[PDB]
Amino acid sequence: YSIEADKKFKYSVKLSDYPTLQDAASAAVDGLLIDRDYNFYGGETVDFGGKVLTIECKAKFIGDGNLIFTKLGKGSRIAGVFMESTTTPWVIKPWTDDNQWLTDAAAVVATLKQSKTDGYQPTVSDYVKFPGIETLLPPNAKGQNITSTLEIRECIGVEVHRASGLMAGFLFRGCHFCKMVDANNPSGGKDGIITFENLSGDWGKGNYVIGGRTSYGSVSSAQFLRNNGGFERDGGVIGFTSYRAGESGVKTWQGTVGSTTSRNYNLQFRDSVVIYPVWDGFDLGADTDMNPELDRPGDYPITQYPLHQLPLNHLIDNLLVRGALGVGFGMDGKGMYVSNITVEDCAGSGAYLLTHESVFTNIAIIDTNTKDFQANQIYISGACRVNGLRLIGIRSGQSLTIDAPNSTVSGITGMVDPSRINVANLAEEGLGNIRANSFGYDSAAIKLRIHKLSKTLDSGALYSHINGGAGSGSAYTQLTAISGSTPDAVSLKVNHKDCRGAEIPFVPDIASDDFIKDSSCFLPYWENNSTSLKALVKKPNGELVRLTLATL
Amino acid sequence: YSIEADKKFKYSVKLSDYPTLQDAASAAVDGLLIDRDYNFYGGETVDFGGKVLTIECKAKFIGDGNLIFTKLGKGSRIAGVFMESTTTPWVIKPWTDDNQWLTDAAAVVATLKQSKTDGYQPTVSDYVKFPGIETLLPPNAKGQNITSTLEIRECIGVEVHRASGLMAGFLFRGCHFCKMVDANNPSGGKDGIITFENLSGDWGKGNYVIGGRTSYGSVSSAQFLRNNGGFERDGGVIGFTSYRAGESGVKTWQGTVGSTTSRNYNLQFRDSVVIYPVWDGFDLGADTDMNPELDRPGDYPITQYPLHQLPLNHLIDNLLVRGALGVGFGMDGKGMYVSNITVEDCAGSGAYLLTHESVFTNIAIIDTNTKDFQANQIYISGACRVNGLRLIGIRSGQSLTIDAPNSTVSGITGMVDPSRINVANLAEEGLGNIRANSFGYDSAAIKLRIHKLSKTLDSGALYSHINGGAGSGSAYTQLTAISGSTPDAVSLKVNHKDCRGAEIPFVPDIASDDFIKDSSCFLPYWENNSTSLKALVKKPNGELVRLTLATL
Amino acid sequence: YSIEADKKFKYSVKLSDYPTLQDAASAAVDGLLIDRDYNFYGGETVDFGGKVLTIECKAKFIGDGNLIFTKLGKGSRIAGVFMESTTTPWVIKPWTDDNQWLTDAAAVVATLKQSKTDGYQPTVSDYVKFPGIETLLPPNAKGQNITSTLEIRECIGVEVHRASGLMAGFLFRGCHFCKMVDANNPSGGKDGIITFENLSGDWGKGNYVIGGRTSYGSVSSAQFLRNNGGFERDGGVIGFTSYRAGESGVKTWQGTVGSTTSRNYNLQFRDSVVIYPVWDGFDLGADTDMNPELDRPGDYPITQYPLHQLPLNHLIDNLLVRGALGVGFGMDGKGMYVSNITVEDCAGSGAYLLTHESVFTNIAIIDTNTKDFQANQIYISGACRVNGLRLIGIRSGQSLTIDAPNSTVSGITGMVDPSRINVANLAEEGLGNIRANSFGYDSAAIKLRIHKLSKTLDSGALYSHINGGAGSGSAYTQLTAISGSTPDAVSLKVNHKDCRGAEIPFVPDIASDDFIKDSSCFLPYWENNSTSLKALVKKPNGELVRLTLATL
Ligand SMILES: C[C@@H]1O[C@@H](O)[C@H](O)[C@H](O)[C@H]1O[C@H]1O[C@H](CO)[C@@H](O)[C@H](O[C@H]2O[C@H](C)[C@@H](O)C[C@H]2O)[C@@H]1O[C@H]1O[C@H](CO)[C@H](O)[C@H](O[C@@H]2O[C@@H](C)[C@H](O[C@H]3O[C@H](CO)[C@@H](O)[C@H](O[C@H]4O[C@H](C)[C@@H](O)C[C@H]4O)[C@@H]3O[C@H]3O[C@H](CO)[C@H](O)[C@H](O)[C@H]3O)[C@@H](O)[C@H]2O)[C@H]1O
Numbered sequence A, B, C: 001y002s003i004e005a006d007k008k009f010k011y012s013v014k015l016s017d018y019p020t021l022q023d024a025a026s027a028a029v030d031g032l033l034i035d036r037d038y039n040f041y042g043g044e045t046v047d048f049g050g051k052v053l054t055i056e057c058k059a060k061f062i063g064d065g066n067l068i069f070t071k072l073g074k075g076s077r078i079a080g081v082f083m084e085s086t087t088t089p090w091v092i093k094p095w096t097d098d099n100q101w102l103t104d105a106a107a108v109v110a111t112l113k114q115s116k117t118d119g120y121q122p123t124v125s126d127y128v129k130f131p132g133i134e135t136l137l138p139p140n141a142k143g144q145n146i147t148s149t150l151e152i153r154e155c156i157g158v159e160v161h162r163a164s165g166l167m168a169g170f171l172f173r174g175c176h177f178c179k180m181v182d183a184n185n186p187s188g189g190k191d192g193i194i195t196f197e198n199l200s201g202d203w204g205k206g207n208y209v210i211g212g213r214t215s216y217g218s219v220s221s222a223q224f225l226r227n228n229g230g231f232e233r234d235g236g237v238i239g240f241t242s243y244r245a246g247e248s249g250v251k252t253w254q255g256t257v258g259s260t261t262s263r264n265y266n267l268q269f270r271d272s273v274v275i276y277p278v279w280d281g282f283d284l285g286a287d288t289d290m291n292p293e294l295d296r297p298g299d300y301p302i303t304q305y306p307l308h309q310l311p312l313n314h315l316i317d318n319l320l321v322r323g324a325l326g327v328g329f330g331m332d333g334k335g336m337y338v339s340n341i342t343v344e345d346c347a348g349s350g351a352y353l354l355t356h357e358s359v360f361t362n363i364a365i366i367d368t369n370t371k372d373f374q375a376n377q378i379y380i381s382g383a384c385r386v387n388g389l390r391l392i393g394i395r396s397g398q399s400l401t402i403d404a405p406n407s408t409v410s411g412i413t414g415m416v417d418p419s420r421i422n423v424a425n426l427a428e429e430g431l432g433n434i435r436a437n438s439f440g441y442d443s444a445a446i447k448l449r450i451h452k453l454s455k456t457l458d459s460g461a462l463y464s465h466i467n468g469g470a471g472s473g474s475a476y477t478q479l480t481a482i483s484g485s486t487p488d489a490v491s492l493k494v495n496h497k498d499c500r501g502a503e504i505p506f507v508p509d510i511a512s513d514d515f516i517k518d519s520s521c522f523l524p525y526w527e528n529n530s531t532s533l534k535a536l537v538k539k540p541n542g543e544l545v546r547l548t549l550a551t552l
């Protein structure tokens, strides 16, 4: 029977049969079942002997610090893991019972409670985010460092599926071809909730967050250091949701970390959603103005690519952000293509784009900067193209809506205040035959505004105005020009009062020679001393003559 | 050997070794394999002893009514389940072999067959949908109630994966943190195919439909009662496809059910598709006009939030509907944000939006109301903002396209008939320099229409018309105004017949004093009694004088 | 103990206990574990006895040719499979270290190396793609046929999950209700990476690619032959990524294969991404001009549906293509609805649409045809509707941007050159009140262009031009018309030089009777022989008279 049993049954060991996790790991051949809660010490390291193991978790790993898994064979999987801290830290909750952000430091301090969830441990970034909070926080709420972290170290082809926890983190250090799949809403601790860090060894590749969601955490929900997906774009974040990140929902790191670059290239960021981050929805920058460095150890030098002009080459498409307190969508880079980005209902700005020679297609920035902290709703520094930009939802100082001074833009839609648009060039080169349809007014308008002349006043207009009442079947058309900073000061009319005639403006005094522009044209003007209209005529040969046009 | 075998083998029991499902459940420790078909009686209840079980199904649960699973531990999973009724009911199939909807009751009755699929059992809603069908249906086709339902009752953290079946339903009653994942196209019965119902106990939270698809069913494919995702938006429907729902693809319930509210708050509805529903694609309403109630037991009172103005706060983005017989996309609520909704090729209306102070961004409503049942393609009752609205595909009475009388709209695209637009305000405030490009005409046009004056006639225009033939290198520009309900009745021309001159309309009789509008302007008029043009002049000082302008 | 062990343990056999895969398959009851590498011979066939098996792979299947799995029960699953060829073939790599495509045949030949990855084996299509390469390739690099293929033959309800490999392929032949799920980036061989082929038996249905990704391969990444999803749209590709297909990312086959149709109907193509295909991103055509046939054995005849006019009825939405060398998005068919397609940064054309009576909603074609091989960026042959079309990113001969000569289009955005637009009709019927905002110029413009007259010259304009300098508070409005192929040749001005008057162009010589268009209008003209302006008057009764208008 022994011989036949060894052949016909599935091999699995279970933690309930062993005093330590290493003892279970050493015994395992195929399956390993975590069927009892396991208290680990920070830095406890398990050697899985290169075995291709299917680890099924049905209980908790309990501990502050890192439980470190090593030497898992390619194809290993870890399902259902649940990390939990031993410490219950002090957390802040900078939002109200109506889900309004709290921005006042004293109000934020008043939210303090001891809990493993429903808030986060204050960080040094909170000292900037909530000015004055550093002074107001009690000592027990500063400098806390509670996270229970599963660390997969120097493994290839390992997947963590359906992970969850409380004050929980997941770290893949020096790994390749690893994935965090269908995260089951872990509640975060002090460190990032999901981290792929490849500061030592080869640049990270094949590392993804696929599906799932996270909540809370003091810093970013999903973050990458020194990963390069290659031209194949083999890595990144797809199908992911982040809620209430203490920093950002999805972050590509900037600057030097330790002795080398933390930056990232060639990753996918797609089909993902970030809601209510304290800082950014997506932060896809590689150079940061928060800690400026004059070189890039381990990366391209400044001499090759200036600050914010790295050839980052990320594949970025179909992203949604709502409720950001900092910036909904932030990035830098040169030669970038970005598409189908929707940022709505944000207390902070919608987009902050330190990009050059880049293209943005179908962007929607809807009711952002709702607090008015920031100078604009969308900012672009460099020479970029925007093709399709929706601005303004239902929310109404002097802050700009779009400040993109070197960018050429087409296809704005929405009830934007034109004085709050600043671009290099705005144009609709390819419209068809047009109709302007006016509702709730006695007139329809096609206005012109020359921003060099004035950003706040229309310089001319083509109007149609009702004659008499509704259903009169009659209107007059009006062609106007600005004078003395008074819109519509001078105008020509057709059919005013249904008269069937053109009303023609004339110069109110003797016209100077230089008032007339073109040959074979005349300019009527008033001669008060004889009660007559004269005409300044530029003849077909270009010479001037003055004629009498209308007399008593 | 016994001691070593107990340590090295995976624990699983299988239904083939037990006379009842409860006997198997009681024996199970880790795995439970369903390896024989199992006939259950309606209401048969299995107590899983709080155990965290991995239930792998490789055979059918056969029965009319509910198989009830209770006391599953958090982390339990049920994979591959297949439910099948014992009864083969009478089903209707209200569509043709060319996939046209049948709307005639007699034609629908003619489709009757006995089958567990390819149709659905008639409901009381069919009596409204197909008027007269209540009288025409035979008795054996009315009042049928066949569903084989897996009921997960009062469990936390249970997931049903890759479920399928025939006349099949899946019910999570009083559950939290449960998921219906990758539904493998179950064919529905009389009840909803996937239901999260939390009428008793705490409001449902953490309950999702993720991925997968369903077909048929008499009512809605995926539906929620008394769920609230919280600010974290922890619940809803993501990545799901519904085909041929007898009611709607995705439904948030409205009104009172039993003694309390069935409504829902703070859910996600994203990245999902509904095709060929008999009623709606997505029905995200919370108050229903189908059964109006004057109060809301267990919810906000009418005094706090009027009908259709609940702060529902759902996260709604990236939805597709095609082929709806009722409304593609229906909702209500106040303060809603909705984005990236595409509704196309629907016999019923595209969108029915009983919303107030809400924002709709990038909506496409393309070839809907193709039967002409309804008054419009998109309706909005309250004071909302629409930023980006695509209307009209290729399909061509007096029904409106958009009736949104309190809404401010920007960015309509498509070959909409302007007379079929009704909004509070329509504007393109932020276009750049413009070009109107005309193809297939001898002219280009920029028209104006004042809807208060006339919804069907343009009130003025700026035209450019070819002089002579193609390649003449010559055109004339024309500025027109409506008179006597005749578009373009009165006009000024520049370069007609390549003459290089302006043709100026004059008043055809003696002009009244009040015909002239502005100071320092003149108005030419005809004096037939002397064959001369006169000028009514409003001098720079505002006083009137009449002068002779042109004479024999 | 034996009796109790047989009841309490999970059944699984493992390949390490058997000399052949068939011996393991015959012994299996529930699980089968592939725990040793297995060398198979091409055509090696395994009979799984109709058993519903869970096959867990933790090692390689090694072999050139096909490993054929048969008689798997419905619900069977195969996870983690890794296919690898025994041969290391010669592969080409037609792209540079800066990820530019190589188009020169000699440069492509220079890339030749022996590898199982990082390139592909040349095919007969490469002879067309890289002209001259057929002559330049060495014999050892032509006619190679290396693929290691897992073939699932004539099974229902089988799923392959997390598959990978090197020179790897996956073939479902004569299968139904089967799925390729979460492909773990297999690197392809000579044949398609994922193929559903149903040339014999019933039309394929229920067959999907869901999630995952592939890299390389000589032909298409995911492809279908003779599948019909039904009205239920039960099959297709959802959530998939293809990189560097040697042919196309996703292909529906065209034409006859063997003795019957290879075409496909009623499939979904959604939420998917194709990057850097050598030919197309998505090829959703059913009739091909590459091998024209005059009939359609096994499909609709040409007499019923002309070439390219099949009622294909695919559900097509939310697709992204970047980096295509051939066409980003190709299709044919009649009565098609297509939505939310984004094609960017392609060396080849963006879209090639041999469609009729079809509707395209929210299309973006951004920086395509960047090499200039092709005649246009987007082509449409038949009578279609386009509602929303974004054109031009940041890239700048005589090639058209859109050539859609029978199509009616609305909602173009972007810096398109108007001379490179060709459509049947272009119109914005439903805009609101309009403002044209000009940045970086001393004027704002609303231009008109009659393409029948000239595609390259505006025929008229409404301008506003600054008077004096910025902040003068003054501008003049100008209404212009083209003459002698000189834009703006003839114009009327209002407020030039802040004169508050209208400058009126007059006919430079004696006006002919036919120069005046409308009754009750006058046309000023020059009489040089008396230094006077005359007026050609068309009286209210329609008769002509000449009057003196201005005199010395
Ligand atoms: C807030 C701002 O918002 C947006 O503007 C913007 O887009 C920025 O990205 C964001 O700024 C943060 O990030 C940028 C870099 O992208 C910084 O330039 C910026 O810092 C500037 O602004 C601050 C407000 C100023 O106070 C300082 C100024 O320079 C800001 O950085 C801050 O947030 C970071 C998180 O996003 C991070 O916490 C920064 O901490 C410093 O730098 C890091 C590298 C040091 O990290 C070690 O200690 C941390 C303990 O607090 C660990 O969390 C960390 O682990 C993580 O990285 C490692 C490599 C990875 O393996 C796991 C990750 O979780 C790292 O931990 C290692 O060392 C510790 C030792 O204490 C421990 O032993 C671990 O075991 C070991 O792995 C950190 O100490 C500190 O120097 C913070 O300033």
Ligand SMILES: C[C@@H]1O[C@@H](O)[C@H](O)[C@H](O)[C@H]1O[C@H]1O[C@H](CO)[C@@H](O)[C@H](O[C@H]2O[C@H](C)[C@@H](O)C[C@H]2O)[C@@H]1O[C@H]1O[C@H](CO)[C@H](O)[C@H](O[C@@H]2O[C@@H](C)[C@H](O[C@H]3O[C@H](CO)[C@@H](O)[C@H](O[C@H]4O[C@H](C)[C@@H](O)C[C@H]4O)[C@@H]3O[C@H]3O[C@H](CO)[C@H](O)[C@H](O)[C@H]3O)[C@@H](O)[C@H]2O)[C@H]1O
Pocket (backbone or CB within 6 Å): B124, B125, B128, B171, B173, B190, B191, B192, B195, B197, B199, B219, B220, B247, B252, B253, B254, B255, B257, B258, B279, B280, B283, B285, B288, B290, B291, B330
């Ligand atoms: C059709 C219309 O389309 C769109 O306009 C619109 O957006 C609407 O939503 C939609 O209207 C339906 O839904 C709204 C509410 O959202 C109703 O207001 C509307 O009803 C009005 O219009 C009808 C056309 C009129 O005939 C009546 C009028 O008030 C309409 O309701 C109809 O459809 C519903 C399905 O969407 C539902 O079937 C309605 O049935 C009534 O109300 C329900 C609550 C009663 O339900 C019990 O019996 C049903 C048996 O038929 C079970 O399906 C049901 O189970 C479901 O809910 C429970 C709580 C959950 O646990 C499981 C779910 O599947 C419920 O079952 C319980 O009781 C039965 C007893 O028979 C059984 O014992 C079960 O074991 C138990 O769980 C139903 O009896 C009836 O009163 C229907 O009117």
Ligand SMILES: C[C@@H]1O[C@@H](O)[C@H](O)[C@H](O)[C@H]1O[C@H]1O[C@H](CO)[C@@H](O)[C@H](O[C@H]2O[C@H](C)[C@@H](O)C[C@H]2O)[C@@H]1O[C@H]1O[C@H](CO)[C@H](O)[C@H](O[C@@H]2O[C@@H](C)[C@H](O[C@H]3O[C@H](CO)[C@@H](O)[C@H](O[C@H]4O[C@H](C)[C@@H](O)C[C@H]4O)[C@@H]3O[C@H]3O[C@H](CO)[C@H](O)[C@H](O)[C@H]3O)[C@@H](O)[C@H]2O)[C@H]1O
Pocket (backbone or CB within 6 Å): C124, C125, C128, C171, C173, C190, C191, C192, C195, C197, C199, C219, C220, C247, C252, C253, C254, C255, C257, C258, C279, C280, C283, C285, C288, C290, C291, C330
């Ligand atoms: C390139 C072009 O790009 C885009 O314009 C466009 O949209 C086109 O789709 C694309 O054109 C290809 O596809 C179209 C049809 O959709 C063709 O019309 C077109 O061919 C024209 O253009 C060429 C450039 C010219 O040289 C010839 C001209 O007619 C072009 O076809 C070419 O690519 C195809 C791949 O996409 C395919 O390789 C064509 O090969 C011919 O036709 C196929 C059907 C024959 O296939 C058998 O042999 C192949 C070995 O090379 C196997 O890969 C193939 O297996 C596949 O199909 C079977 C049915 C399925 O079960 C598994 C699939 O992988 C098939 O294999 C069977 O037979 C072989 C025998 O050698 C073997 O025994 C297998 O075991 C068995 O299953 C092929 O032989 C050849 O006639 C190629 O011309």
